[PDB]
Design a binder for this molecule. Structure first.
Ligand SMILES: Nc1ncnc2c1ncn2[C@@H]1O[C@H](COP(=O)(O)OP(=O)(O)O)[C@@H](O)[C@H]1O
Ligand SMILES: Nc1ncnc2c1ncn2[C@@H]1O[C@H](COP(=O)(O)OP(=O)(O)O)[C@@H](O)[C@H]1O
Ligand SMILES: [Mg+2]
Ligand SMILES: [Mg+2]
Lengths: 205, 207
């Protein structure tokens, strides 16, 4: 059982490369792909608390709660069954998104220590500037979570994305050495990068 | 200036009875606010939808209660200790230590989880046997909640038999925390008034 994690700023190419790589493993091996889509516990609590301003701390516990249920209901059982699990975003998303709002990152690390470290974590390194260009063409609505609208209320969605995804990057780069991140340069072509992905993974043998 | 006073003990040991008697005394001299460990209704909606697809692990339940506590802690508890109040917490984080470690969650990880929370200025551990506590809820005519009986970890037992063994394991965790958490051990066998006058002696000296 091997767990491979993708992380990087939003619009950095995470899911697009995650789905092409699940199309590759699926021909040869058991593979299961997950995104942080969050799940039902985040939905209940957010709706119940739509009126109040909750603290980053409480937001942090809500996401970890919802992740803990996916982790022990799907992720961990499939790694016990031998599957490869591809996580489109893993616990290092929570490290950044909650530590950037003043939650003690070492407390977040302890919070998530119930989770196995990925066999490999692909850090797709892309500038916020270059990555913002792609969501403009995709016709997507720019979610407030993506712009850090809670932290940057005065800015426009566009302007908030640039500043928020920047501090996200600093936390990611801070994790590179301690977390054995492998940094992939997301500047490149989807396929060009994709063949870098398939080489690194294959090494497992 | 703000002071936080905690009661801990198994269910039916008298915590709420002594917390409210102590609130009747403190409010004569100072601003005091009494808080309980009551869950928000979104938890009961979590358990409802859970009972429909699959069972959540003790770990997720532990994170659910810490989430529910963190919000109450930072919306009511922490501002009022910052405002100088006395806060009486009928149950506090050591209930979470006990309830989560007896279901196999690493107690040292739970300590890290709740480490955002201030440690009580005083913690009264109201110690009574499961035998004695079960005797009183039977006199109280009240129904023994499955959570009180550990129904999730001891299904099949009767409420009485489940209460007895479950609160025994809760007692073991409380007894294990006494020294490191500087518990004030109260012999809850005694009288409500005798206990309460012992309690007001301890509190007055502190404040
Ligand atoms: N390397 C790339 N170059 C150009 N466009 C891309 C690249 N990767 C993804 N896209 C496009 O940009 C958008 C970002 O998609 P996606 O990778 O799902 O973002 P996320 O990383 O948030 O999941 C998509 O509309 C996709 O079609
Ligand atoms: N010191 C005491 N001695 C005898 N009975 C008590 C004492 N304190 C409380 N009781 C009774 O025993 C029960 C325990 O109630 P409570 O204070 O709600 O326990 P807890 O909050 O610890 O569950 C209540 O029915 C109460 O009437
Ligand atoms: Mg995505
Ligand atoms: Mg009580």
């Amino acid at each position: 059982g091997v767990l491979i994690a993708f992380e990087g700023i939003d619009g950095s190419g995470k899911s697009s490369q995650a789905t092409l790589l699940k199309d590759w493993i699926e021909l040869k091996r058991d593979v299961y792909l997950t995104e942080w889509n969050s799940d039902w516990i985040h939905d209940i609590i957010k709706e119940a608390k739509k009126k109040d301003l909750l603290t980053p701390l409480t937001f942090s516990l809500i996401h970890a709660t919802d992740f803990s249920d996916r982790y022990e209901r799907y992720i961990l059982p499939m790694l016990k069954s031998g599957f490869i699990v591809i996580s489109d975003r893993y616990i290092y998303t929570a490290y950044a998104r909650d530590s950037v709002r003043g939650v003690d990152i070492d407390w977040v690390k302890k919070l998530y220590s119930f989770a196995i470290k990925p066999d490999i974590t692909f850090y797709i390194r892309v500038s916020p500037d270059i990555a913002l260009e792609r969501i403009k063409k995709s016709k997507r609505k720019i979610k407030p979570q993506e712009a850090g609208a809670d932290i940057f209320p005065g800015l426009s969605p566009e302007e908030g994305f640039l500043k928020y995804q920047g501090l996200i990057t600093e936390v990611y780069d801070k994790l590179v050495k301690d977390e054995n991140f492998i940094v992939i340069d997301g500047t490149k072509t989807p396929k060009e990068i994709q063949i870098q992905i398939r080489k690194f993974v294959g090494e497992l043998i």
